């Protein structure tokens, strides 16, 4: 049974690796949108700060 399970574990590792790769891309896209929005929000405050300094 261990020998049969070893083949199943080998297939499971490939399946888990593919799932993690898809999750990594999904996590990256979600993180990038939040990271870009957070940086834009800070820069928007700087834009108002730059405008206030200019005025």
């Amino acid at each position: 049974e261990q020998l049969a399970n070893a083949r199943r574990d080998y297939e499971a590792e490939i399946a888990r690796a593919r799932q993690e790769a898809a999750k990594i891309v999904a996590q990256a896209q979600e993180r990038a949108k939040q990271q870009e929005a957070e940086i834009i929000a800070q820069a928007r405050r700087e834009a108002e700060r730059l405008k206030e300094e200019a005025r």
């Binding site: 261990q2 020998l3 399970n5 070893a6």
Partner: protein, 51 residues
């Protein structure tokens, strides 16, 4: 003195009885050999599974 007919008669029955036991001995030898082969295969398969 001992009559050889009596000695041969007992030996003949013993030889036939030993012949029957020889078939029984062959079967136990095969069963012991099969157990060794199964145990050896289990150890070999166990190493491959871990790797």
């Amino acid at each position: 003195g001992i009559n050889p007919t009596l000695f041969i008669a007992q030996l003949i029955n013993f030889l036939l009885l030993i012949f029957i036991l020889r078939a029984l001995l062959y079967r136990p030898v095969m069963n012991l050999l099969n157990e060794r082969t199964r145990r050896i295969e289990e150890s070999v398969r166990d190493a491959e599974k871990v790797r």
